[PDB]
Amino acid sequence: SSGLVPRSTTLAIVRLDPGLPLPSRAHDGDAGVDLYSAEDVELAPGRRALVRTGVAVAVPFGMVGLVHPRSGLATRVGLSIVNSPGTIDAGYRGEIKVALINLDPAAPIVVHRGDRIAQLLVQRVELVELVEVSSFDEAG
Amino acid sequence: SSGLVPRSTTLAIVRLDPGLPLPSRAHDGDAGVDLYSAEDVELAPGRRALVRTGVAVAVPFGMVGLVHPRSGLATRVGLSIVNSPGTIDAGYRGEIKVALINLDPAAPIVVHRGDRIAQLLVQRVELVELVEVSSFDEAG
Amino acid sequence: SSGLVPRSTTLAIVRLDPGLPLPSRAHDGDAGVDLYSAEDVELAPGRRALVRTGVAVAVPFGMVGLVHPRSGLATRVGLSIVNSPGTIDAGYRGEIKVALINLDPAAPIVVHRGDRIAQLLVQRVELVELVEVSSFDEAG
Ligand SMILES: O=c1ccn([C@H]2C[C@H](O)[C@@H](COP(=O)(O)NP(=O)(O)OP(=O)(O)O)O2)c(=O)[nH]1
Ligand SMILES: O=c1ccn([C@H]2C[C@H](O)[C@@H](COP(=O)(O)NP(=O)(O)OP(=O)(O)O)O2)c(=O)[nH]1
Ligand SMILES: O=c1ccn([C@H]2C[C@H](O)[C@@H](COP(=O)(O)NP(=O)(O)OP(=O)(O)O)O2)c(=O)[nH]1
Ligand SMILES: [Mg+2]
Numbered sequence A, B, C: 001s002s003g004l005v006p007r008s009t010t011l012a013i014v015r016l017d018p019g020l021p022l023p024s025r026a027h028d029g030d031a032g033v034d035l036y037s038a039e040d041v042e043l044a045p046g047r048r049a050l051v052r053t054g055v056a057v058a059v060p061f062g063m064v065g066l067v068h069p070r071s072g073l074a075t076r077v078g079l080s081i082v083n084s085p086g087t088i089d090a091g092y093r094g095e096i097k098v099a100l101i102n103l104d105p106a107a108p109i110v111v112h113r114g115d116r117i118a119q120l121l122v123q124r125v126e127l128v129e130l131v132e133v134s135s136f137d138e139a140g
Protein backbone atom coordinates (compact mmCIF):
# COMPACT_ATOMS: atom_id res chain seq x y z
CA SER A 1 0.00 0.00 0.00
CA SER A 2 2.46 2.61 1.35
CA GLY A 3 5.27 1.07 -0.69
CA LEU A 4 3.74 2.18 -3.99
CA VAL A 5 5.09 5.49 -5.28
CA PRO A 6 2.03 7.54 -6.28
CA ARG A 7 1.83 9.43 -9.56
CA SER A 8 11.81 10.41 -4.09
CA THR A 9 14.22 12.30 -4.29
CA THR A 10 15.66 9.89 -1.72
CA LEU A 11 18.15 10.92 0.95
CA ALA A 12 20.43 8.28 2.48
CA ILE A 13 20.78 8.84 6.16
CA VAL A 14 22.81 7.28 8.95
CA ARG A 15 21.72 7.64 12.50
CA LEU A 16 25.11 7.96 14.17
CA ASP A 17 22.94 8.18 17.33
CA PRO A 18 20.39 5.42 16.98
CA GLY A 19 18.58 6.49 20.15
CA LEU A 20 17.04 9.46 18.27
CA PRO A 21 14.02 9.21 15.97
CA LEU A 22 14.64 9.62 12.31
CA PRO A 23 14.12 13.22 11.18
CA SER A 24 10.49 13.52 10.15
CA ARG A 25 8.17 15.91 8.36
CA ALA A 26 5.63 17.20 10.86
CA HIS A 27 3.02 17.16 8.04
CA ASP A 28 2.43 16.20 4.45
CA GLY A 29 4.20 18.65 2.14
CA ASP A 30 6.31 20.21 4.91
CA ALA A 31 9.52 21.55 3.44
CA GLY A 32 11.79 20.22 6.16
CA VAL A 33 12.44 17.23 8.31
CA ASP A 34 13.10 18.09 11.89
CA LEU A 35 16.54 17.45 13.30
CA TYR A 36 17.01 16.32 16.86
CA SER A 37 19.59 17.21 19.44
CA ALA A 38 21.69 14.30 20.52
CA GLU A 39 22.65 16.34 23.55
CA ASP A 40 21.61 18.43 26.54
CA VAL A 41 22.91 21.96 26.27
CA GLU A 42 22.22 25.13 28.06
CA LEU A 43 22.70 28.44 26.27
CA ALA A 44 22.99 31.59 28.26
CA PRO A 45 21.93 34.75 26.40
CA GLY A 46 24.24 35.29 23.46
CA ARG A 47 25.99 31.97 23.81
CA ARG A 48 26.24 29.47 21.01
CA ALA A 49 26.98 25.78 20.77
CA LEU A 50 27.67 23.37 17.96
CA VAL A 51 25.09 20.78 18.70
CA ARG A 52 25.23 17.20 17.42
CA THR A 53 22.11 15.94 15.64
CA GLY A 54 23.17 12.30 15.56
CA VAL A 55 22.68 12.00 11.80
CA ALA A 56 24.79 12.08 8.71
CA VAL A 57 23.28 12.43 5.28
CA ALA A 58 24.30 12.09 1.64
CA VAL A 59 22.82 15.08 -0.13
CA PRO A 60 22.59 14.20 -3.80
CA PHE A 61 25.01 15.79 -6.23
CA GLY A 62 23.27 18.78 -7.73
CA MET A 63 21.54 19.40 -4.38
CA VAL A 64 22.12 21.06 -1.08
CA GLY A 65 20.95 20.43 2.43
CA LEU A 66 19.83 23.44 4.31
CA VAL A 67 19.49 23.69 8.01
CA HIS A 68 16.81 26.17 9.04
CA PRO A 69 15.70 27.32 12.53
CA ARG A 70 12.31 26.21 13.78
CA SER A 71 9.98 29.16 14.00
CA GLY A 72 8.28 28.28 17.31
CA LEU A 73 11.57 28.20 19.28
CA ALA A 74 12.77 31.28 17.49
CA THR A 75 9.82 33.26 18.66
CA ARG A 76 9.21 31.70 22.02
CA VAL A 77 12.76 31.67 23.36
CA GLY A 78 15.00 33.43 20.81
CA LEU A 79 16.72 30.27 19.62
CA SER A 80 18.44 30.79 16.31
CA ILE A 81 21.21 29.30 14.23
CA VAL A 82 24.39 31.28 13.75
CA ASN A 83 25.14 30.22 10.16
CA SER A 84 21.51 29.96 9.09
CA PRO A 85 20.75 28.69 6.65
CA GLY A 86 23.24 25.97 7.37
CA THR A 87 24.66 24.67 4.13
CA ILE A 88 25.19 20.94 3.81
CA ASP A 89 27.21 20.05 0.73
CA ALA A 90 26.60 16.98 -1.45
CA GLY A 91 30.03 15.67 -0.51
CA TYR A 92 29.63 15.94 3.25
CA ARG A 93 29.42 12.60 5.03
CA GLY A 94 30.05 13.90 8.52
CA GLU A 95 27.55 14.42 11.33
CA ILE A 96 25.22 17.35 10.87
CA LYS A 97 25.93 19.79 13.63
CA VAL A 98 23.73 22.79 14.40
CA ALA A 99 25.24 26.07 15.53
CA LEU A 100 22.53 27.04 17.96
CA ILE A 101 22.63 30.48 19.52
CA ASN A 102 20.50 32.12 22.18
CA LEU A 103 19.41 35.54 20.86
CA ASP A 104 17.37 36.32 23.93
CA PRO A 105 18.89 39.17 26.00
CA ALA A 106 18.31 37.58 29.37
CA ALA A 107 16.80 34.12 29.51
CA PRO A 108 18.80 30.95 29.05
CA ILE A 109 17.64 28.24 26.73
CA VAL A 110 17.90 24.64 27.74
CA VAL A 111 17.96 22.16 24.90
CA HIS A 112 17.35 18.55 25.87
CA ARG A 113 18.47 15.48 24.06
CA GLY A 114 15.52 14.50 21.91
CA ASP A 115 14.31 18.08 21.27
CA ARG A 116 13.75 19.20 17.74
CA ILE A 117 16.24 22.01 17.23
CA ALA A 118 16.25 22.66 13.51
CA GLN A 119 14.84 21.54 10.24
CA LEU A 120 16.56 20.16 7.23
CA LEU A 121 15.44 21.02 3.75
CA VAL A 122 16.89 19.58 0.54
CA GLN A 123 16.92 21.64 -2.62
CA ARG A 124 18.52 21.53 -6.02
CA VAL A 125 21.29 24.04 -6.39
CA GLU A 126 22.91 25.44 -9.53
CA LEU A 127 26.51 24.33 -9.58
CA VAL A 128 27.43 27.43 -11.49
CA GLU A 129 30.24 27.85 -13.87
CA LEU A 130 31.76 31.28 -13.33
CA VAL A 131 32.42 33.27 -16.42
CA GLU A 132 34.62 36.22 -15.72
CA VAL A 133 34.02 39.24 -17.79
CA SER A 134 35.49 42.72 -17.62
CA SER A 135 32.00 44.16 -17.71
CA PHE A 136 28.45 43.00 -18.11
CA ASP A 137 27.85 44.39 -21.65
CA GLU A 138 30.48 41.88 -22.71
CA ALA A 139 28.85 38.77 -21.18
CA GLY A 140 25.89 39.94 -23.27
CA SER B 1 -1.92 43.12 -23.29
CA SER B 2 -0.69 42.39 -19.73
CA GLY B 3 -3.04 39.42 -19.50
CA LEU B 4 -1.09 37.42 -22.08
CA VAL B 5 1.47 35.05 -20.58
CA PRO B 6 4.68 35.61 -22.58
CA ARG B 7 6.79 32.75 -23.89
CA SER B 8 3.08 31.40 -13.17
CA THR B 9 3.83 29.57 -10.83
CA THR B 10 0.80 31.25 -9.23
CA LEU B 11 0.47 31.83 -5.50
CA ALA B 12 -3.01 32.25 -3.99
CA ILE B 13 -2.98 34.93 -1.39
CA VAL B 14 -5.49 36.31 1.08
CA ARG B 15 -5.05 39.74 2.49
CA LEU B 16 -6.31 39.13 6.03
CA ASP B 17 -5.51 42.87 6.38
CA PRO B 18 -6.94 44.50 3.28
CA GLY B 19 -5.52 47.89 4.23
CA LEU B 20 -2.02 46.73 3.18
CA PRO B 21 -0.80 46.61 -0.42
CA LEU B 22 -0.34 43.23 -1.94
CA PRO B 23 3.25 41.99 -1.59
CA SER B 24 5.11 43.15 -4.68
CA ARG B 25 8.39 42.60 -6.46
CA ALA B 26 10.36 45.83 -6.35
CA HIS B 27 11.66 45.02 -9.86
CA ASP B 28 11.37 42.61 -12.74
CA GLY B 29 13.09 39.33 -11.86
CA ASP B 30 13.38 40.12 -8.14
CA ALA B 31 13.42 36.89 -6.17
CA GLY B 32 11.03 38.05 -3.48
CA VAL B 33 7.85 39.93 -2.91
CA ASP B 34 8.01 42.31 -0.04
CA LEU B 35 5.90 41.63 3.01
CA TYR B 36 4.34 44.44 4.98
CA SER B 37 3.86 44.93 8.66
CA ALA B 38 0.25 45.12 9.68
CA GLU B 39 1.43 46.69 12.91
CA ASP B 40 3.46 49.33 14.70
CA VAL B 41 6.16 47.79 16.84
CA GLU B 42 9.16 49.08 18.59
CA LEU B 43 12.12 46.80 19.17
CA ALA B 44 14.68 47.72 21.75
CA PRO B 45 18.15 46.27 21.12
CA GLY B 46 17.98 42.49 21.29
CA ARG B 47 14.22 42.36 21.47
CA ARG B 48 12.11 40.38 19.06
CA ALA B 49 8.48 40.40 18.04
CA LEU B 50 6.28 38.15 15.98
CA VAL B 51 4.91 40.64 13.56
CA ARG B 52 1.72 40.12 11.55
CA THR B 53 2.03 40.65 7.79
CA GLY B 54 -1.70 40.61 7.10
CA VAL B 55 -1.43 37.89 4.46
CA ALA B 56 -1.92 34.19 4.21
CA VAL B 57 -0.67 32.20 1.28
CA ALA B 58 -1.05 28.74 -0.24
CA VAL B 59 2.43 27.63 -1.18
CA PRO B 60 2.08 24.94 -3.79
CA PHE B 61 2.75 21.34 -2.86
CA GLY B 62 6.32 20.59 -3.83
CA MET B 63 7.28 24.18 -2.89
CA VAL B 64 8.23 26.24 0.08
CA GLY B 65 7.81 29.84 1.03
CA LEU B 66 10.83 31.48 2.47
CA VAL B 67 10.85 34.63 4.47
CA HIS B 68 14.10 36.55 4.09
CA PRO B 69 15.27 39.80 5.75
CA ARG B 70 15.54 42.91 3.61
CA SER B 71 19.14 43.89 3.20
CA GLY B 72 18.73 47.68 3.56
CA LEU B 73 17.12 47.43 7.03
CA ALA B 74 19.60 44.80 8.04
CA THR B 75 22.49 47.06 7.35
CA ARG B 76 21.01 50.39 8.27
CA VAL B 77 19.41 49.48 11.59
CA GLY B 78 20.32 45.86 12.39
CA LEU B 79 16.86 44.46 11.73
CA SER B 80 16.95 40.73 11.24
CA ILE B 81 14.65 37.75 11.46
CA VAL B 82 15.19 35.23 14.23
CA ASN B 83 14.26 32.09 12.28
CA SER B 84 15.61 33.31 8.95
CA PRO B 85 15.00 31.97 6.51
CA GLY B 86 11.44 31.62 7.66
CA THR B 87 9.99 28.42 6.31
CA ILE B 88 6.41 28.49 5.06
CA ASP B 89 5.06 25.02 4.39
CA ALA B 90 2.74 24.12 1.52
CA GLY B 91 0.05 23.17 4.02
CA TYR B 92 0.10 26.39 6.01
CA ARG B 93 -3.01 28.53 5.61
CA GLY B 94 -2.41 30.77 8.59
CA GLU B 95 -1.18 34.36 8.62
CA ILE B 96 2.48 34.80 7.80
CA LYS B 97 4.15 36.22 10.85
CA VAL B 98 7.70 37.57 10.86
CA ALA B 99 9.95 37.09 13.86
CA LEU B 100 11.71 40.41 13.70
CA ILE B 101 14.64 41.03 15.99
CA ASN B 102 16.76 44.10 16.64
CA LEU B 103 20.42 43.06 16.40
CA ASP B 104 21.68 46.56 17.02
CA PRO B 105 23.46 46.91 20.40
CA ALA B 106 21.93 50.23 21.33
CA ALA B 107 19.40 51.78 18.99
CA PRO B 108 15.74 50.82 18.94
CA ILE B 109 13.98 50.05 15.73
CA VAL B 110 10.51 51.34 15.12
CA VAL B 111 8.50 49.42 12.56
CA HIS B 112 5.39 51.16 11.30
CA ARG B 113 2.30 49.59 9.87
CA GLY B 114 2.83 49.67 6.13
CA ASP B 115 6.63 49.23 6.26
CA ARG B 116 8.21 46.50 4.25
CA ILE B 117 9.79 44.20 6.82
CA ALA B 118 10.72 41.08 4.92
CA GLN B 119 10.59 39.41 1.58
CA LEU B 120 8.91 36.25 0.55
CA LEU B 121 10.48 33.91 -1.95
CA VAL B 122 8.88 30.74 -3.31
CA GLN B 123 11.04 27.82 -4.33
CA ARG B 124 10.60 24.19 -5.20
CA VAL B 125 11.78 21.90 -2.45
CA GLU B 126 12.68 18.22 -2.57
CA LEU B 127 10.20 16.34 -0.44
CA VAL B 128 12.82 13.75 0.31
CA GLU B 129 12.27 10.17 1.11
CA LEU B 130 14.71 9.18 3.83
CA VAL B 131 16.54 5.96 3.28
CA GLU B 132 18.25 4.79 6.41
CA VAL B 133 21.43 2.94 5.93
CA SER B 134 23.97 1.66 8.43
CA SER B 135 26.71 3.30 6.41
CA PHE B 136 27.16 5.17 3.19
CA ASP B 137 28.99 2.40 1.24
CA GLU B 138 25.74 0.50 1.54
CA ALA B 139 23.44 3.18 0.07
CA GLY B 140 25.91 2.95 -2.81
CA SER C 1 40.18 18.01 -21.59
CA SER C 2 38.68 20.33 -18.93
CA GLY C 3 36.93 22.35 -21.63
CA LEU C 4 34.56 19.50 -22.49
CA VAL C 5 31.22 19.67 -20.69
CA PRO C 6 30.60 16.16 -19.32
CA ARG C 7 27.26 14.40 -19.67
CA SER C 8 26.56 25.39 -16.64
CA THR C 9 24.37 27.18 -15.45
CA THR C 10 26.98 29.89 -16.06
CA LEU C 11 27.29 33.00 -13.91
CA ALA C 12 28.95 36.10 -15.37
CA ILE C 13 31.13 37.74 -12.82
CA VAL C 14 33.18 40.92 -12.66
CA ARG C 15 35.98 41.23 -10.20
CA LEU C 16 35.61 44.89 -9.29
CA ASP C 17 38.65 44.10 -7.08
CA PRO C 18 41.00 42.12 -9.28
CA GLY C 19 43.41 41.51 -6.41
CA LEU C 20 41.02 38.89 -4.94
CA PRO C 21 40.75 35.31 -6.20
CA LEU C 22 37.63 34.40 -8.05
CA PRO C 23 35.00 32.87 -5.74
CA SER C 24 35.59 29.13 -5.75
CA ARG C 25 33.91 25.94 -4.64
CA ALA C 26 36.02 24.38 -1.91
CA HIS C 27 35.08 20.93 -3.32
CA ASP C 28 33.29 19.18 -6.13
CA GLY C 29 29.52 19.48 -5.65
CA ASP C 30 29.78 22.19 -2.98
CA ALA C 31 26.65 24.32 -3.05
CA GLY C 32 28.42 27.64 -2.76
CA VAL C 33 31.38 29.57 -3.99
CA ASP C 34 33.20 31.40 -1.29
CA LEU C 35 33.17 35.17 -1.31
CA TYR C 36 36.17 37.16 -0.21
CA SER C 37 36.46 40.33 1.76
CA ALA C 38 38.02 43.15 -0.16
CA GLU C 39 38.66 44.84 3.16
CA ASP C 40 40.05 44.69 6.67
CA VAL C 41 37.35 45.17 9.25
CA GLU C 42 37.13 44.69 12.92
CA LEU C 43 33.79 43.88 14.52
CA ALA C 44 33.33 44.38 18.20
CA PRO C 45 30.66 42.16 19.78
CA GLY C 46 27.28 43.03 18.29
CA ARG C 47 28.69 45.32 15.64
CA ARG C 48 27.98 44.89 11.98
CA ALA C 49 29.58 46.10 8.78
CA LEU C 50 28.63 46.05 5.14
CA VAL C 51 31.68 44.43 3.71
CA ARG C 52 32.70 44.68 0.05
CA THR C 53 33.41 41.38 -1.70
CA GLY C 54 34.97 42.93 -4.79
CA VAL C 55 32.64 41.09 -7.17
CA ALA C 56 29.50 41.80 -9.09
CA VAL C 57 27.45 39.06 -10.66
CA ALA C 58 24.62 38.64 -13.14
CA VAL C 59 22.27 36.11 -11.61
CA PRO C 60 20.22 34.64 -14.41
CA PHE C 61 16.59 35.64 -14.77
CA GLY C 62 14.54 32.97 -13.05
CA MET C 63 17.31 32.58 -10.45
CA VAL C 64 18.52 34.10 -7.25
CA GLY C 65 21.87 34.49 -5.61
CA LEU C 66 21.99 33.68 -1.98
CA VAL C 67 24.64 34.76 0.40
CA HIS C 68 25.09 32.30 3.25
CA PRO C 69 27.41 32.44 6.31
CA ARG C 70 30.32 30.03 6.46
CA SER C 71 29.78 27.50 9.19
CA GLY C 72 33.34 27.38 10.56
CA LEU C 73 33.45 31.13 11.32
CA ALA C 74 29.95 31.01 12.67
CA THR C 75 30.89 28.44 15.22
CA ARG C 76 34.43 29.45 15.96
CA VAL C 77 33.95 33.19 16.39
CA GLY C 78 30.22 33.94 16.12
CA LEU C 79 30.43 35.59 12.71
CA SER C 80 27.05 35.78 11.06
CA ILE C 81 25.26 37.75 8.38
CA VAL C 82 22.50 40.12 9.41
CA ASN C 83 20.21 39.60 6.41
CA SER C 84 21.08 35.94 5.91
CA PRO C 85 20.34 34.53 3.55
CA GLY C 86 21.37 37.52 1.52
CA THR C 87 19.19 37.79 -1.54
CA ILE C 88 20.84 38.78 -4.80
CA ASP C 89 18.30 39.58 -7.49
CA ALA C 90 18.71 38.71 -11.18
CA GLY C 91 18.72 42.41 -12.02
CA TYR C 92 21.43 43.44 -9.59
CA ARG C 93 24.68 44.50 -11.24
CA GLY C 94 26.19 46.20 -8.22
CA GLU C 95 28.94 44.92 -5.94
CA ILE C 96 27.92 42.13 -3.61
CA LYS C 97 28.24 43.42 -0.10
CA VAL C 98 28.01 41.21 2.97
CA ALA C 99 26.36 42.45 6.15
CA LEU C 100 28.67 40.76 8.59
CA ILE C 101 27.82 40.87 12.27
CA ASN C 102 29.68 39.69 15.34
CA LEU C 103 27.26 37.61 17.44
CA ASP C 104 29.86 36.81 20.05
CA PRO C 105 29.13 38.49 23.42
CA ALA C 106 32.68 39.53 24.14
CA ALA C 107 35.34 38.80 21.55
CA PRO C 108 35.97 40.98 18.53
CA ILE C 109 36.30 39.50 15.11
CA VAL C 110 38.95 40.73 12.75
CA VAL C 111 38.27 40.12 9.08
CA HIS C 112 41.25 40.55 6.79
CA ARG C 113 41.22 41.40 3.14
CA GLY C 114 41.43 38.06 1.38
CA ASP C 115 39.45 36.10 4.02
CA ARG C 116 36.52 34.04 2.94
CA ILE C 117 33.55 35.63 4.69
CA ALA C 118 30.51 34.10 3.05
CA GLN C 119 29.36 31.75 0.38
CA LEU C 120 27.27 32.40 -2.64
CA LEU C 121 24.74 29.90 -3.86
CA VAL C 122 22.66 30.23 -7.01
CA GLN C 123 19.21 28.69 -7.18
CA ARG C 124 16.18 28.85 -9.39
CA VAL C 125 13.36 30.79 -7.83
CA GLU C 126 9.66 30.82 -8.67
CA LEU C 127 8.77 34.26 -9.94
CA VAL C 128 5.28 33.83 -8.62
CA GLU C 129 2.18 35.39 -9.92
CA LEU C 130 0.02 36.40 -6.97
CA VAL C 131 -3.59 35.47 -7.22
CA GLU C 132 -5.64 37.24 -4.62
CA VAL C 133 -8.58 35.38 -3.32
CA SER C 134 -11.02 36.19 -0.54
CA SER C 135 -10.46 32.74 0.89
CA PHE C 136 -8.65 29.56 0.06
CA ASP C 137 -11.73 27.43 -0.81
CA GLU C 138 -12.15 29.83 -3.71
CA ALA C 139 -8.64 29.47 -5.19
CA GLY C 140 -9.58 25.79 -5.17
O1 LIG D 1 8.83 32.95 9.38
C1 LIG D 1 7.83 32.10 9.48
C2 LIG D 1 8.04 30.73 9.52
C3 LIG D 1 6.94 29.89 9.61
N1 LIG D 1 5.70 30.42 9.66
C4 LIG D 1 4.55 29.53 9.76
C5 LIG D 1 4.36 28.87 8.40
C6 LIG D 1 4.99 27.50 8.61
O2 LIG D 1 4.41 26.51 7.76
C7 LIG D 1 4.70 27.25 10.07
C8 LIG D 1 5.67 26.25 10.68
O3 LIG D 1 7.00 26.74 10.50
P1 LIG D 1 8.16 25.97 11.32
O4 LIG D 1 8.00 24.50 10.98
O5 LIG D 1 9.48 26.67 11.01
N2 LIG D 1 7.77 26.23 12.95
P2 LIG D 1 7.70 25.02 14.12
O6 LIG D 1 8.45 23.75 13.74
O7 LIG D 1 8.17 25.64 15.43
O8 LIG D 1 6.14 24.63 14.35
P3 LIG D 1 5.41 23.31 13.73
O9 LIG D 1 5.52 22.26 14.82
O10 LIG D 1 4.00 23.83 13.46
O11 LIG D 1 6.17 22.96 12.45
O12 LIG D 1 4.84 28.50 10.73
C9 LIG D 1 5.52 31.76 9.61
O13 LIG D 1 4.28 32.32 9.66
N3 LIG D 1 6.59 32.59 9.52
O1 LIG E 1 23.49 40.15 1.15
C1 LIG E 1 23.11 40.95 0.16
C2 LIG E 1 21.78 41.09 -0.19
C3 LIG E 1 21.46 41.93 -1.25
N1 LIG E 1 22.45 42.57 -1.90
C4 LIG E 1 22.10 43.45 -3.02
C5 LIG E 1 21.71 42.57 -4.19
C6 LIG E 1 20.19 42.61 -4.15
O2 LIG E 1 19.61 42.42 -5.44
C7 LIG E 1 19.94 44.00 -3.61
C8 LIG E 1 18.58 44.12 -2.95
O3 LIG E 1 18.50 43.14 -1.90
P1 LIG E 1 17.24 43.29 -0.89
O4 LIG E 1 16.01 43.36 -1.76
O5 LIG E 1 17.37 42.18 0.15
N2 LIG E 1 17.49 44.78 -0.13
P2 LIG E 1 16.31 45.98 0.04
O6 LIG E 1 14.88 45.47 -0.13
O7 LIG E 1 16.56 46.67 1.37
O8 LIG E 1 16.57 47.11 -1.10
P3 LIG E 1 15.73 47.24 -2.49
O9 LIG E 1 14.64 48.23 -2.19
O10 LIG E 1 16.80 47.72 -3.46
O11 LIG E 1 15.22 45.84 -2.82
O12 LIG E 1 20.96 44.25 -2.64
C9 LIG E 1 23.74 42.40 -1.55
O13 LIG E 1 24.75 43.05 -2.20
N3 LIG E 1 24.06 41.59 -0.52
O1 LIG F 1 24.80 24.03 9.69
C1 LIG F 1 25.76 23.31 9.15
C2 LIG F 1 26.46 23.75 8.04
C3 LIG F 1 27.46 22.93 7.52
N1 LIG F 1 27.70 21.74 8.10
C4 LIG F 1 28.74 20.88 7.54
C5 LIG F 1 28.22 20.30 6.24
C6 LIG F 1 28.87 21.18 5.19
O2 LIG F 1 29.06 20.50 3.95
C7 LIG F 1 30.18 21.52 5.86
C8 LIG F 1 30.79 22.80 5.31
O3 LIG F 1 29.84 23.86 5.48
P1 LIG F 1 30.39 25.36 5.22
O4 LIG F 1 31.03 25.33 3.86
O5 LIG F 1 29.23 26.32 5.49
N2 LIG F 1 31.57 25.59 6.41
P2 LIG F 1 33.12 26.18 6.12
O6 LIG F 1 33.26 26.93 4.80
O7 LIG F 1 33.52 27.00 7.34
O8 LIG F 1 34.15 24.91 6.08
P3 LIG F 1 34.74 24.25 4.72
O9 LIG F 1 36.06 24.93 4.50
O10 LIG F 1 34.83 22.77 5.12
O11 LIG F 1 33.71 24.50 3.63
O12 LIG F 1 29.90 21.69 7.24
C9 LIG F 1 26.99 21.32 9.17
O13 LIG F 1 27.22 20.12 9.77
N3 LIG F 1 26.01 22.12 9.69
MG1 LIG G 1 8.09 22.95 11.92
Ligand SMILES: [Mg+2]
Binding pocket: B026, B070, B071, B119
Ligand atom coordinates in the same frame (compact mmCIF):
# COMPACT_ATOMS: atom_id res chain seq x y z
MG1 LIG H 1 14.48 44.33 -1.75
Ligand SMILES: [Mg+2]
Binding pocket: C026, C070, C071, C119
Ligand atom coordinates in the same frame (compact mmCIF):
# COMPACT_ATOMS: atom_id res chain seq x y z
MG1 LIG I 1 32.54 26.04 3.14
